[PDB]
Design a protein around this ligand. Structure first.
Ligand code: CA
Length: 448
């Protein structure tokens, strides 16, 4: 067959049958063969098995003559940042994301933190690994421990004017992932009053695997915001490349609205810039970008597509509705830290609460959120939807699945390639009733 752990965009599998130290070592050998010259940055998340997987990567890389820069326990964005900042040949983050306790994985980048994906080197690595029966060589290169975060912290702080920040009270919820370490290193340089929830890194996850999208986990941040009168709350996934916002009422802010909000924050600092966004939910972003003087650039969803498009357009910022925010100055990479710093600055400077910054936008472009449908036949299910609506003559766009614009409402319907699974997003022009009736109509068709 093929090694199942090699996915479209990263490596992910059950330990030890899909991913283990031997495979990790072979991946390091294969990665050395795929990169231009230079050292390789390695970091890892809080999962208990992550360090051993990193050590195996390092052994394979060093056997292949690659100097290894061990940045230690970190966030995925720190591997991206250090790979670019240190002008490394590439980098690997060992991270299991929100997969089960017996899973782990790896995210791999080349120069400037450019993604390595299935069609840009990852399956080449897979095929090399799959055929590698060579004896493990011994190291011919060194490993250096580089735990200085100064340049990374200075870079994060460079997105805000610290003299304009107010002493907001912010709930922070690392979910026992790694975000608290960075929050605590930033805190001496900021005026905020932090309320720390599930703050200590703990790969045993006594409070659940970090995933702020699950209602039980969502509610822990909401409750802390409400009980403490916080201005807003921020939660992260375990490797903290995704952040999640809760307004002063405890309400979780759907990620769609953060794209337009962050674009308007960034466009104040880089006037006339291009902003890349995905096709699932669009109308609010296009309007907010244009109103702020930027140029919106439609792009297929998925971090590799977003990053490539930002590069080709010199786009200052790119944002996906699914809590991914990318910054040109950050090597075009995603950060779960930059967004909350920008939002805290916007609340501080504007005098407006996070709730009021988004309220009118959510009313003007209400959306369904992303709704997933396991179906027996994705192609037949999409066909049923498109047949049902054909007589309305929607404007169709095929940038990412099917987008259908009917005038006062639109949807995007995307099909998973890993399993028969359709993802639906609907939005309307200020009409909650139409949003629900159309969402339910499409849902009935997809389940047919
Ligand atoms: Ca993540």
């Amino acid at each position: 067959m093929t090694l199942p752990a090699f996915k479209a965009y990263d490596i992910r599998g059950r330990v030890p049958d899909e991913l283990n130290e031997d495979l990790a070592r072979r991946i390091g050998v294969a990665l050395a063969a795929q990169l231009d010259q230079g050292p390789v940055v390695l970091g890892h998340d809080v999962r208990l098995a992550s360090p051993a997987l990193q050590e195996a990567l390092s052994a394979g890389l060093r056997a292949s003559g690659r100097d290894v820069i061990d940045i230690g326990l970190c966030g995925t964005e720190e591997v991206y940042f250090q790979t670019d900042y240190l002008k490394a040949a590439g980098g690997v983050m060992v991270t299991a994301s929100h997969n089960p306790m017996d899973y782990n994985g790896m995210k791999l980048v080349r120069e400037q933190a450019r993604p390595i994906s299935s069609d840009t080197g990852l399956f080449a690595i897979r095929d090399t690994v799959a055929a590698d029966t060579a004896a493990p060589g011994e190291p011919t290169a060194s490993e250096q421990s580089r735990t200085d975060k100064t340049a990374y912290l200075e870079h994060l702080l460079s997105y805000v004017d610290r003299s304009t920040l107010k002493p907001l009270k912010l709930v922070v919820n690392a979910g026992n992932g790694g975000a608290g370490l960075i929050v605590d290193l930033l805190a001496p340089h900021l005026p905020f009053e932090f309320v720390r929830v599930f703050h200590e890194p703990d790969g045993n996850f006594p409070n659940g695997i970090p995933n702020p999208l699950l209602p039980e986990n969502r509610d822990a941040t909401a409750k802390a915001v409400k009980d403490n009168g916080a201005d807003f709350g921020i939660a992260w996934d375990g490797d903290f490349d995704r952040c999640f916002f809760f307004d002063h009422t405890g309400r979780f802010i759907e990620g769609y609205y953060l794209v337009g909000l962050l674009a308007q924050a960034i466009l104040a600092k880089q006037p006339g810039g291009k902003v890349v966004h995905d096709p699932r939910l669009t109308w609010n972003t296009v309007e907010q970008v244009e109103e702020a003087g930027g140029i919106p650039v439609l792009c297929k969803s998925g971090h590799a597509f977003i990053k490539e498009k930002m590069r080709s357009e010199n786009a200052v910022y790119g944002g996906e509705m699914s809590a991914h925010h990318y910054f040109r100055e950050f090597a075009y990479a995603d950060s779960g830290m930059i967004p909350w710093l920008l939002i805290a600055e916007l609340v501080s400077q504007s005098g407006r609460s996070l709730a009021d910054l988004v309220e009118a936008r959510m009313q003007k472009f209400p959306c369904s959120g992303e709704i997933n449908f396991k179906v027996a036949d994705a192609k037949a299910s999409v066909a049923r939807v498109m047949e049902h609506y054909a007589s309305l003559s929607p404007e169709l766009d095929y940038t990412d699945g099917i987008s259908a614009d009917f005038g006062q409402w639109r949807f995007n319907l995307r099909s998973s390639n890993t399993e028969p699974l359709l993802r639906l997003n609907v939005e309307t022009r200020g009409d909650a009733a139409l949003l629900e009736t159309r969402t339910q109509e499409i849902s009935n068709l997809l389940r047919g």
